[PDB]
Amino acid sequence: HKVYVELQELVMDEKNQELRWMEAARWVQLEENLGENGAWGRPHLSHLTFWSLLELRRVFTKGTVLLDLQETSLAGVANQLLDRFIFEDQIRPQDREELLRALLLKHSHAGELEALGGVKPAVLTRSGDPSQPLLPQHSSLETQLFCEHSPSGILEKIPPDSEATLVLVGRADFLEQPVLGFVRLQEAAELEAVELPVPIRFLFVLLGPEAPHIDYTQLGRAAATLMSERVFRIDAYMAQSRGELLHSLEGFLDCSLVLPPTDAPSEQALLSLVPVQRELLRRRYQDDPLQQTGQLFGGLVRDIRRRYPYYLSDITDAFSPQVLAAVIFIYFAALSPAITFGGLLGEKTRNQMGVSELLISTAVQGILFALLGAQPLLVVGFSGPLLVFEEAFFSFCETNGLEYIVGRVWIGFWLILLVVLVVAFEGSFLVRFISRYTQEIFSFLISLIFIYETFSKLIKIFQDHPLQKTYNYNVLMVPKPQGPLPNTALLSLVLMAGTFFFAMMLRKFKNSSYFPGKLRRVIGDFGVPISILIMVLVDFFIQDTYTQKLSVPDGFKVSNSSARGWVIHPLGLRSEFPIWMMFASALPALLVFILIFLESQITTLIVSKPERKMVKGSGFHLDLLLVVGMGGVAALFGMPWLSATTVRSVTHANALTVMGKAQIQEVKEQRISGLLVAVLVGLSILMEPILSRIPLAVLFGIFLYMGVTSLSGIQLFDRILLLFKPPKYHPDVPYVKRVKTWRMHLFTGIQIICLAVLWVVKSTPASLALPFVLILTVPLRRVLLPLIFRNVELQCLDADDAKAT
Amino acid sequence: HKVYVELQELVMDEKNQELRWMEAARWVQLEENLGENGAWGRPHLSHLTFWSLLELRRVFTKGTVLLDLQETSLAGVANQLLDRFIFEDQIRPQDREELLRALLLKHSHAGELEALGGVKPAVLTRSGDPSQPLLPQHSSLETQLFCEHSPSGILEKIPPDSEATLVLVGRADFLEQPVLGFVRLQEAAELEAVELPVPIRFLFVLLGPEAPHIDYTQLGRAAATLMSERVFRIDAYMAQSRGELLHSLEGFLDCSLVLPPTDAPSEQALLSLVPVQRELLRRRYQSSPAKPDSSDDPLQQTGQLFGGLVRDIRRRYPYYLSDITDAFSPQVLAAVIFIYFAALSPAITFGGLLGEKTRNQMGVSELLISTAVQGILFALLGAQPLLVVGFSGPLLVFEEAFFSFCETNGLEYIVGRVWIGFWLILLVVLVVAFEGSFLVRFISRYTQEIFSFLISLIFIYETFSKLIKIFQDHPLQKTYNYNVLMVPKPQGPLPNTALLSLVLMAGTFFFAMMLRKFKNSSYFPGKLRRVIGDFGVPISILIMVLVDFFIQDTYTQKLSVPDGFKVSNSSARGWVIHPLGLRSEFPIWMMFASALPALLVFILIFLESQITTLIVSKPERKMVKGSGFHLDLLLVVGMGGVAALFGMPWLSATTVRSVTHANALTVMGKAQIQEVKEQRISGLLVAVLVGLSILMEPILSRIPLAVLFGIFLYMGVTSLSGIQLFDRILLLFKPPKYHPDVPYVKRVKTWRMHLFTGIQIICLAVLWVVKSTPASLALPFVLILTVPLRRVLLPLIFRNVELQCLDADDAKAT
Numbered sequence A: 001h002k003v004y005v006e007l008q009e010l011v012m013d014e015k016n017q018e019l020r021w022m023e024a025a026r027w028v029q030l031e032e033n034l035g036e037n038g039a040w041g042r043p044h045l046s047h048l049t050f051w052s053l054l055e056l057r058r059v060f061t062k063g064t065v066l067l068d069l070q071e072t073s074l075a076g077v078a079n080q081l082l083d084r085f086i087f088e089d090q091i092r093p094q095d096r097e098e099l100l101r102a103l104l105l106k107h108s109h110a111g112e113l114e115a116l117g118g119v120k121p122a123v124l125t126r127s128g129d130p131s132q133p134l135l136p137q138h139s140s141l142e143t144q145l146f147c148e149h150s151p152s153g154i155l156e157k158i159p160p161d162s163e164a165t166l167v168l169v170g171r172a173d174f175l176e177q178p179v180l181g182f183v184r185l186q187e188a189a190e191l192e193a194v195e196l197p198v199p200i201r202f203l204f205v206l207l208g209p210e211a212p213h214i215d216y217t218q219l220g221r222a223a224a225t226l227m228s229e230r231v232f233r234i235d236a237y238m239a240q241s242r243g244e245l246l247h248s249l250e251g252f253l254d255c256s257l258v259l260p261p262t263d264a265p266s267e268q269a270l271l272s273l274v275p276v277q278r279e280l281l282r283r284r285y286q287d288d289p290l291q292q293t294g295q296l297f298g299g300l301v302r303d304i305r306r307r308y309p310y311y312l313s314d315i316t317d318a319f320s321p322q323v324l325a326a327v328i329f330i331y332f333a334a335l336s337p338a339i340t341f342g343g344l345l346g347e348k349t350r351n352q353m354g355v356s357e358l359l360i361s362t363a364v365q366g367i368l369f370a371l372l373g374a375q376p377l378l379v380v381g382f383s384g385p386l387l388v389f390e391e392a393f394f395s396f397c398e399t400n401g402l403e404y405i406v407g408r409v410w411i412g413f414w415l416i417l418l419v420v421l422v423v424a425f426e427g428s429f430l431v432r433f434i435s436r437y438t439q440e441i442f443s444f445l446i447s448l449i450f451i452y453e454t455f456s457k458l459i460k461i462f463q464d465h466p467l468q469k470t471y472n473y474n475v476l477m478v479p480k481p482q483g484p485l486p487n488t489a490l491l492s493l494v495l496m497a498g499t500f501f502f503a504m505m506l507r508k509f510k511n512s513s514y515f516p517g518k519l520r521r522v523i524g525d526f527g528v529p530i531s532i533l534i535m536v537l538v539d540f541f542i543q544d545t546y547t548q549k550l551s552v553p554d555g556f557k558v559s560n561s562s563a564r565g566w567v568i569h570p571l572g573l574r575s576e577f578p579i580w581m582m583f584a585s586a587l588p589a590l591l592v593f594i595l596i597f598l599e600s601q602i603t604t605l606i607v608s609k610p611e612r613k614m615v616k617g618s619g620f621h622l623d624l625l626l627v628v629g630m631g632g633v634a635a636l637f638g639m640p641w642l643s644a645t646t647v648r649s650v651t652h653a654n655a656l657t658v659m660g661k662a663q664i665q666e667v668k669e670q671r672i673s674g675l676l677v678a679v680l681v682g683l684s685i686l687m688e689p690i691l692s693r694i695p696l697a698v699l700f701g702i703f704l705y706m707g708v709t710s711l712s713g714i715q716l717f718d719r720i721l722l723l724f725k726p727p728k729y730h731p732d733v734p735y736v737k738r739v740k741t742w743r744m745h746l747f748t749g750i751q752i753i754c755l756a757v758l759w760v761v762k763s764t765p766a767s768l769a770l771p772f773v774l775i776l777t778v779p780l781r782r783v784l785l786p787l788i789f790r791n792v793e794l795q796c797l798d799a800d801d802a803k804a805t
Numbered sequence B: 001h002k003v004y005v006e007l008q009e010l011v012m013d014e015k016n017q018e019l020r021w022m023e024a025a026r027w028v029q030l031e032e033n034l035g036e037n038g039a040w041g042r043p044h045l046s047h048l049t050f051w052s053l054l055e056l057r058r059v060f061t062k063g064t065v066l067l068d069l070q071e072t073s074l075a076g077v078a079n080q081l082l083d084r085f086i087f088e089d090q091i092r093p094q095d096r097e098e099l100l101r102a103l104l105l106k107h108s109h110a111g112e113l114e115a116l117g118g119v120k121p122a123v124l125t126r127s128g129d130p131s132q133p134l135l136p137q138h139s140s141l142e143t144q145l146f147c148e149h150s151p152s153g154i155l156e157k158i159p160p161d162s163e164a165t166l167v168l169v170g171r172a173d174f175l176e177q178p179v180l181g182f183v184r185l186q187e188a189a190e191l192e193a194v195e196l197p198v199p200i201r202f203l204f205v206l207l208g209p210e211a212p213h214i215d216y217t218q219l220g221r222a223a224a225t226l227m228s229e230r231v232f233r234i235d236a237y238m239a240q241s242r243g244e245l246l247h248s249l250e251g252f253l254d255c256s257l258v259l260p261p262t263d264a265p266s267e268q269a270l271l272s273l274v275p276v277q278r279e280l281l282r283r284r285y286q287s288s289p290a291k292p293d294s295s296d297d298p299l300q301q302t303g304q305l306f307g308g309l310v311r312d313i314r315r316r317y318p319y320y321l322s323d324i325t326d327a328f329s330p331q332v333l334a335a336v337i338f339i340y341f342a343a344l345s346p347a348i349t350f351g352g353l354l355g356e357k358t359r360n361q362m363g364v365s366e367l368l369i370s371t372a373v374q375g376i377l378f379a380l381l382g383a384q385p386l387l388v389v390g391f392s393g394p395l396l397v398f399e400e401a402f403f404s405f406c407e408t409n410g411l412e413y414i415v416g417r418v419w420i421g422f423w424l425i426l427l428v429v430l431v432v433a434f435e436g437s438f439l440v441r442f443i444s445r446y447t448q449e450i451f452s453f454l455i456s457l458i459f460i461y462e463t464f465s466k467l468i469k470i471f472q473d474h475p476l477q478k479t480y481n482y483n484v485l486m487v488p489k490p491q492g493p494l495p496n497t498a499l500l501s502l503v504l505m506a507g508t509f510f511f512a513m514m515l516r517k518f519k520n521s522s523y524f525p526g527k528l529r530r531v532i533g534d535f536g537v538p539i540s541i542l543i544m545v546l547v548d549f550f551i552q553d554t555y556t557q558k559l560s561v562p563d564g565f566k567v568s569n570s571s572a573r574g575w576v577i578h579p580l581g582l583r584s585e586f587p588i589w590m591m592f593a594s595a596l597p598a599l600l601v602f603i604l605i606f607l608e609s610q611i612t613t614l615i616v617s618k619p620e621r622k623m624v625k626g627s628g629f630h631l632d633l634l635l636v637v638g639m640g641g642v643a644a645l646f647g648m649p650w651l652s653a654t655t656v657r658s659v660t661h662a663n664a665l666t667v668m669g670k671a672q673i674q675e676v677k678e679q680r681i682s683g684l685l686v687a688v689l690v691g692l693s694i695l696m697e698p699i700l701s702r703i704p705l706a707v708l709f710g711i712f713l714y715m716g717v718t719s720l721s722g723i724q725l726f727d728r729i730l731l732l733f734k735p736p737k738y739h740p741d742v743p744y745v746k747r748v749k750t751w752r753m754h755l756f757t758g759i760q761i762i763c764l765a766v767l768w769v770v771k772s773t774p775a776s777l778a779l780p781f782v783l784i785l786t787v788p789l790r791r792v793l794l795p796l797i798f799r800n801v802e803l804q805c806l807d808a809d810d811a812k813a814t
Ligand SMILES: *[C@@H]1O[C@H](CO)[C@@H](O)[C@H](O)[C@H]1NC(C)=O
Pocket: A350, A351, A560, A562, A563
């Protein structure tokens, strides 16, 4: 049982001359004292003096014990203890009345102190009238050094199941020698006289006359420090006589160490004691998500059985407001690039595919993926390399003289067959070979390209509206701003920078210590929507300046209703389809499959790494099947296929993270967020008045915030930051100590060279040959580096787990 | 001050069973042990045990003591000690003949260990033959911790002239109770037991049989630790009987700290006993003749005329060569380049405002020349060369009022300022004569903090007001006119001015803050890192000036200075003003009544300058060389008067400029304020540049006015760091769980700190409201009325310890 110790002593108040027991310390966790004003001091360890322990041993060697006493009140305990004192000739038969009357006085506490006008220690007297002691009345040292919402707090520190201990110290003049009385009850009782939070089990009584080298407050502190150690209170629970208590006291005195008066500095002399005290105390107490299975379709069933038992938890975990904030954030984060790519694809293919098709496809592939998905934190959507492939395929069909929207149907069919074949043979276990190398390179490149595109958009805005001395004002701005405008470029820059600054400031305030934790975290989790609202209001207040806004199609209509319909006839739309193209459409399908598979699986690897404390399981085969099948079915209806997005998924996962004081505690995983985001993206056509007032330049700040925030966990980025610091300030990670510095720098340089080569290939019109080089990084890590480095260096640098290396 | 102590035990040699003395520990202010190997562990402090101290006290309370014994060899000492044992019924007469042959034996040091083969604990018996101990033994603690070069350091640490002690322990079965012998030789002499050439003065001899709770190694260590302490050594060097040694032992045990075993020991709670140890140390030294080894006023009333002036001269001027020499760092150049703009911009603004206010009687050129001259002179002959003199706002308000008064009464304006200067001169001479600057002592930290906070807040407010003015001049419209003539000034709104100005200001502020934060990082080599971080403001200024210079078609307001060293209004003014009358003769009644505004100007200047000198030269900001008050006040006021003679305005020390200057010349530690660079070259160079600014028209005409607003915001935000009311205001929002560990948090309850902060904020608000009232010139009076508020009203609400802890005059000591 845990213990709660309380020390009380006989005192007299100056208001009225009446004795009473008042408390003066406590030993819940660390000792605390009671000042003169009536407020408790500061907690601290319990340091004793030499004479205190000496006299404690001396008076305990011949003390009086009452073990397994059967009483339930303080009066019975007091009477039995006085009877036991009388039995062993510790006090005289005529000293019993005064002692019993003194032990049964009222026990005050810290609260009543102010109502008394102060208290001072007192001594019992035969006539019953107190007097002032004939001994130096200097205040204690602990009072001098530690004294000159609390009840609930002390209730919280006291353990749930714990028993109380009461120590009574007092001075009486009619005695002849110090007397000790130790009592243990048969069962914990709540004594009415003396009040404590928990019920009393043990009881100390310390009385005696004035003697040299005896300070009774220090004797009480020594007894309470005895009663606060684990081993002594265990031995006090089991003991049945006094000899066992004496043996425990000898063991207690064996494992104490003295610190003499040393002239050394305080902190050094007090910190030199840690190993010695440690030694003395030691002397005192003497499955896989990816795996090859011997069954057809094994991975699919394995992932189903792993994930679907968590469906009710996935539904329920969505009741926090942080989920709503994450929804509002990712809605814009996924809508803006959707609109941009929609406009580009509409202007690229003569409006064969536009914004509405992309929006509908995004909505459907979000709803279905959120309902039937294994990891509902992914965000599916169109990408850039996919746009490049669409460009190339449209150019190819324009050159050879075939249709375009029809061939995509056969490409989707080939995709369906290939994904069925791949899922049948569980060929996703190859994800095991993708190490941290490729994940880090991919994420770094993606974030860097994101930031680059944002800055490119800004520079385009500056190029469209230059800084001139005069402008024309009979300009028609109905379709699009023709010619430069006075204040657009700078208002756009101001709004973007302001949004970025507010987002960063709120992100830092979230982790600060300025408000109550609940409201602070609630406000910090809604940082991005608050900043967006602020900047939207700021733009709404400005009247005369023009700024580009968000615009969506008018209704659920096809982009070009001249040549297209809601359903596409596979045999031929206007002219019949050749046979050789039907059979050769497999060639672009394989490349699209490689792209989709690699991107989706690498995204699932980055999001779902073992380091990010993901309790519920994540599925690979199921996500691939869903994504590719829905992409094919949407290509059937003429809508585009989509894929999992890196920045959007990483931002989604990072938004739903509750962090500890920083420590990553938990990630809120649920299916409601994705469903709501998809429903809003679908219904976006019914929210014209609200979206038509959101300027396009505000979302650039959000894009910069996402690109900067997604860059934190990357380790190549950390090693790049370490490229500048001198080796004196390098961190305490294993890859610093195990390998020399100028080898780590060579590693980082090799990886940066790989980045640069990937970038150069990305700028080359042979961009579609981007995936191959990427997978060619896998042999590089498997073969070439072990020809340069050593095995321990390579295991320590490219570690799959952070904690274990 | 330090001695040598040696502990030797009675052990057996492993090769062939025999008895001999072997040393086990040595003490030179620190304990060093040796293990079975024969090599001493690393030195450390000594930590005794409870049982050792208990048995040492018990055996010492009745142990025999021989003081001032006149013997030189170990045999005559053992003889006298055994005889004294015999006399006091300690040992039987049939025991001496054995103990003697036990004591007069070969002593072997550590060097002979390997040649011997190791040693073991041994127990003497009645016959004279060795034997094994009966009770079980255990591995020693200190030899297990520290044992698992030294002779050089040992022979180094012992002072050249010092005495040593010698402790001999060993067990004997034919004894009844433990015995202790303590002998102090009358004149220290060489002894065959110690190989070190140090002479011996004290000797402990501890004998007895085996018993529980008695470890003779630990008891010898306890005795040695008692002799190593200084108080017990001084007492033993002068004690004449056993009572004094007993008293010293009781004192040593009284001031000791024993700590019992615990369940979960931690290095954080064990550090909560630090003050206790200090108090115990103090109490130990309280009654000791020994002392522990590790444990003029700038303002003052002097009985002579002009005492303060001579005191300040004698204090400061001996440092003149160091003040000249300390300027060879590049940080001085960076501070010069920063403060040049920081002082030039408000000078130009206030000059233009005063020129348009008084119909160009006084303008920009007069202000520039006056600033230059009073800066050169103050840097050359000043006591505190970190102040920046210049025009202020309240001075502008007073100039407005005086111009209005002279307009109303029908008198001239530039002439009355001459008589005001004369009255100022006489008053400052009278004040310096009677050393009346000691009153600066009564102004506590309260008023200093309020003043600095208000100044910084007003600065930021004026900056934002300038920005809002820029926005008001060029609103955001749909169409503008382009046949606008901008020769005198841009008439009507312009398309892109307001946003380019805001962008430049924000960019400069952002870059300055980023470089200030990069200065403290650990990203580049320290030398280049600190050099780049120290030049943050000039680098940002150059970057933003170039950025604005590259943009061609957009208009932004630039810096403009007068064409030449000419007077503002050459119609009614001259370089020298005739005192009798410029156009009409001056009345007599006005000559005698011009004293009334002079007293107010004197009060303003004195208060501002002295509070500024307090803020700059507080003891907390590691200011080594002394700072003078009377001399600086005299210099400032005299140059202000002499400039009013020449028609130029009078100036005063500026708060924000001086604090920024002082903060720029500060070398900070990785934080700890390592040092501050104090020199006289920076101020003189700044003054010379401000004076020559008229010769840099092509360079200054290309610096946009909106870039300096970012610098103004940077100075106002940076100058807000050291304020303590600001810290307590930040603490107004945090919950009491995250409050820092400063004394004013722990000593007082929370809602009292909050009441204090609320009162001070109310005072701030009242100051602001009176500042906005057209009765602004009554702002200084109210300010000094804050001094009685702290002296009378607060002691009616708080208590003395609370008031001393909150309004602390020193930061570190509270
Ligand atoms: C829609 O498609 C037809 C098909 O010939 C084309 O002529 C027309 O330009 C398209 N509309 C656009 C591109 O807006």
